[PDB]
């Protein structure tokens, strides 16, 4: 009915043993996109570009619901609870509701704007439960539910890309009509809901290692293996020899080991002290990249690698880490104090440093003549016996990604962080039903071009159940914990200021507790 | 099936990312102009957007044109070929890892030993011309697999400082990395159906 | 269990029984302590059943910055575990079920990976055999031939040898080695947090080619000591160098390049250029054998608790 | 429904032996507070003051219902009955109802103000039954139900204070979002109610 509410405001968190259930409700507004039309888009329509930036695709009159960020579900305090008390977590169940739909019509006279209710208009909503549409979630896009529950947000417009040759299309390109799906139609008084079960995924590692991969031995006992220690008796000619020694606590670098650090793809090193950087432009020319069909793409963020060495936190890889913007930061050429650079220093115990060579390999045969020659390894692929950690997740970062439907993949954990699934939470698509203005009184076969100006508003609720993996550590000394600082300040961190603006002052990871290797 | 989307074109072309990328390192011409400027990655600059998955592995092949006048006037069938060694014996890398045969609009090029070549009916066995054979092309997998006759990409090879400039190097062979996706080689009406996996301790795909 | 007390006077040592003393024993069944087994340490049960052995002391390492510790470092007290206390007269026992693991391969291959074809039948695939008609200018051509028993090197194959990480080659005939010190400088290594570690023994690779058993990789094989061998700078006749020659049929040789890759585009001008592959990571379609086990060698290891691992 | 009343006007008192039951009904108006925003407030935002008057806190877009005054429940004659005839009294039970919700939209042209019904709008209401919010009742504030049942009253705005150092905040200060609570949503046609039992308290000495 018109006078009865279709749902209530549900927003809290329940901590139930080894489960936590988060619930979020937000207020959304949806405009009419594209004047109800499907439009072909390309870099031609955007004004042209280089070959690396060419594309072809379509924008649709539909919008979509995205909640693929952790702050859509966790408050900062709840995130603190989770990361300070658990070794792991993963999503299990999802429930989604859309309710209290209101459709408004806008009339603009010469000098006045009037907004009225349109009680008989509809919104169309459907889920892509069979994964038949291009999946644009999982590209770290704007338009998710806002972190602050009081913020009213605008629903982003749906569009997609297909195969391109420059700004042109090939015969293999696909065009999708979203009206060619069955969808539910809602007047003011109807609601929509659905449930979803997550795939079985591994727990995320919300811990750091308290041991290093090269320091796993007993520091008191020798090995029963020998290593070559000398090849010449001394100075002079014809001094060749072979001497062997026991590998022990005095020489840990030469001990035999069972496991080796994971793969690498070297990045350029950039200092936040700008005077230490080379006085030249190297953002694009000095960057690591990969090529596909003649197009170059930045290797960003790339394989999970440690950001810097010990004591070198002023250095960061060129495109090897996630960079978030601070509240109120612009979009073009902002200074370093306006952005937030994450660092994966916790994985330095298993993962190679991002701005270093993996190691050295022999490159010749020494003989009595050529000396022994070695070469640097700048990119090392997977080898048997390698171990590694994945990239951390953040309160501001993405949760899941869709694994591409391919013949083969390896370790399909998404490179920007999170859970990779073949059947992720489905896309939820929504659109205001077009309402024509007065048609002519003589028949015309052309499609109608005049429409009543409308938009819609409502409430959306998402509830996720997460499974937790508790710590049972035997460590004696206290752990490192995420904490607020007592020292006085003008504002409270993770709160509003005097003007009403909510901000997140820093990125928060998940790795504070410790575990052995 | 073939993919109607490319691995580097999986984003919404209307919405910005909430991630930033380094866009400028010098304020302008002159000495001591060092700076750090960051920009939002969006639809105008798709090459610098953050991505979750990357193309599969590569092992570069030499490029041969079916227009013979474009080829080098020398013998390079064996000397210029990609190969692997086993117990001191060299074997051709043939057909090798599944890679795209050529770029867009370059169907006259083919990898030296990266594709299956069938004979036409009545074709001999020794030194037959190109019109007597049938060269397959795996152009459908260019959306996930790197091109067979190209480098995988570029890697940094030094530390830039205020002095050394930023230096990069070509990757001619890239092994498996986590987050890589790829397609396998297509099958043909004339081609094989199955093979026996060798009885070994380990194998991959 | 027998507990003895020792009293040392000015010039005499007396050993007596202490009937009321205890030993404490426990198993780390939840894997809460640093696992120092699996580092090929001394102190195991002796091979000869008549030898009386001394129990090794337990110690462990944690995160370090030079010789200093960081706030992430863990300190473990072993008294903070429940343990059984035994007087002379008590015993201790427990049982354990192994995880499901693959069988170890106690066999060698009688076939080579590049020799899996029928040596009597041609392939139905062609290969490029000639690119120039002959000597002279403007002789470009394309000629194709059937791959058959006469040219086995160019046949199409379904599977390729496993990964590699090249090692330096050392001869046991010392006069053949370079007259310089290259044990550390010429060695293969990997880096972690600015620290260099020897790649030892590294990926399972064949030690040498056919007929070159005098060569061995610098740090690519297990070296055992003979009975009575010292610990510092002993000669080669005092140690025992293992060789993984049985896996040469699937695994690349440790002291060789994996192969060659193209490094340019030939055209009519640049000639065809190739480059050596010194380290090759995993590729789809690769097969390999693992390292052999020995009567003197280790049995098991603990896989590190990480997000990802391969084989 | 739109055309059906959600409740009746109940306002009287029943004297039943050793019990008295009071019932009060009033008409309320609620505006939009803070332009729907949460704002940080302090003596800095108020213009400064002495040390004894410094504070730090937040104002919210929510209002609240207060009836913590005796004339919200007792008429003067009922009060006379109580105090002239009893040595003691204490509260035992409470029932609360909110009904006949009407939401109006206001449009202001160049020289005219038009008020219309918005039949599809909602009000959100909830009780802090677990006592998780700062309790601002019990500070003798204005904004209660008026003594005279015919007076229409305006709902006061909710705000609270936390730890301050001058006009600054410390790390121990708490920020509360009231949207982080489950609340009932009411269109014109819905009503809200709840019941409460008072703690055992001693009789007041009248």
UniProtKB/TrEMBL annotation, chain D:
An example Gene Ontology molecular-function term: structural molecule activity
Is Calcium among the key words of this record? yes
Q: Which UniProt keywords apply?
A: Calcium, Capsid protein, Metal-binding, T=1 icosahedral capsid protein, Virion
Q: What is its main location?
A: virion
Provide the Gene Ontology terms for cellular component. T=1 icosahedral viral capsid
Subcellular location(s): the record lists: Virion
Does the keyword Calcium feature in the UniProt annotation? yes
Q: TM spans, by residue?
A: none
Q: Which family does it belong to?
A: Belongs to the parvoviridae capsid protein family.
- Annotated protein name in UniProt: Capsid protein VP1
Q: What is the lineage of its organism?
A: Viruses, Monodnaviria, Shotokuvirae, Cossaviricota, Quintoviricetes
User: Gene symbol?
Assistant: cap
């Amino acid at each position: 009915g018109v006078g009865s509410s279709s749902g209530n405001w549900h927003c809290d968190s329940q901590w139930l043993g080894d489960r936590v259930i988060t619930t979020s409700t937000r207020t959304w507004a949806l405009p009419t996109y594209n004047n109800h039309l499907y439009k072909q888009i390309s870099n031609s329509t955007s004004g042209g570009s280089s070959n690396d930036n060419a594309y072809f695709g379509y924008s649709t009159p539909w919008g979509y619901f995205d909640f693929n960020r952790f702050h859509c579900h966790f408050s900062p305090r709840d995130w603190q609870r989770l990361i300070n008390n658990n070794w792991g977590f993963r999503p299990k169940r999802l429930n989604f509701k859309l309710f209290n739909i209101q459709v408004k019509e806008v009339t603009d006279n010469n000098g006045v704007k009037t907004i009225a209710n349109n009680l008989t208009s509809t919104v169309q909503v459907f889920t892509d439960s069979d994964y038949q549409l291009p999946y644009v979630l999982g590209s770290a896009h704007e338009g998710c539910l806002p972190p602050f529950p009081a913020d009213v947000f605008m629903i982003p417009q749906y569009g997609y890309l297909t195969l391109n040759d420059g700004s042109q299309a090939v015969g293999r390109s696909s065009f999708y009509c979203l009206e060619y799906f069955p969808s539910q139609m809602l007047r003011t008084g109807n609601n929509f809901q659905f449930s979803y079960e997550f795939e079985n995924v591994p727990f995320h590692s919300s811990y750091a290692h308290s041991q290093s991969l090269d320091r796993l031995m007993n520091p008191l006992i020798d090995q029963y293996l020998y290593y070559l220690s000398k090849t010449i008796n001394g100075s002079g000619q014809n001094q060749q020899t072979l001497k062997f020694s026991v590998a022990g606590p005095s020489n840990m670098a030469v001990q035999g080991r069972n496991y080796i650090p994971g793969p690498s793809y070297r990045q350029q090193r950039v200092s936040t002290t700008v005077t230490q950087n080379n006085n030249s432009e190297f953002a694009w020319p000095g960057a690591s990249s990969w090529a596909l069909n003649g197009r170059n793409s930045l290797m960003n963020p790339g394989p999970a690698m440690a950001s810097h060495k010990e004591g070198e936190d002023r250095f960061f890889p060129l495109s090897g880490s996630l960079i978030f913007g601070k509240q109120g930061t612009g979009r073009d050429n902002v200074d370093a104090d306006k952005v937030m650079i994450t660092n994966e220093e916790e994985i330095k115990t298993t993962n190679p440093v991002a701005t270093e060579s993996y190691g050295q390999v022999a490159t010749n045969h020494q003989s009595a003549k050529a000396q022994a020659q070695t070469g640097w390894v700048q990119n090392q692929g997977i080898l048997p016996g390698m171990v590694w950690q994945d990239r951390d997740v953040y309160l501001q970062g993405p949760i899941w990604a869709k694994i591409p439907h391919t013949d083969g993949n390896f370790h399909p954990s998404p490179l920007m962080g999170g859970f990779g699934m073949k059947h992720p939470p489905p896309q939820i698509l929504i659109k205001n039903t077009p309402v024509p203005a007065d048609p002519p009184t003589a028949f015309n076969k052309d499609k109608l071009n005049s429409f009543i100006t409308q938009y819609s508003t409502g409430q959306v609720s998402v509830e996720i159940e997460w499974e937790l993996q508790k710590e049972n550590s035997k460590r004696w000394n206290p752990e490192i914990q995420y904490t607020s600082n007592y020292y006085k300040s003008n504002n409270v961190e993770f709160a509003v200021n005097t003007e009403g603006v909510y901000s997140e002052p820093r990125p928060i990871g998940t790795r504070y507790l410790t575990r052995n290797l």
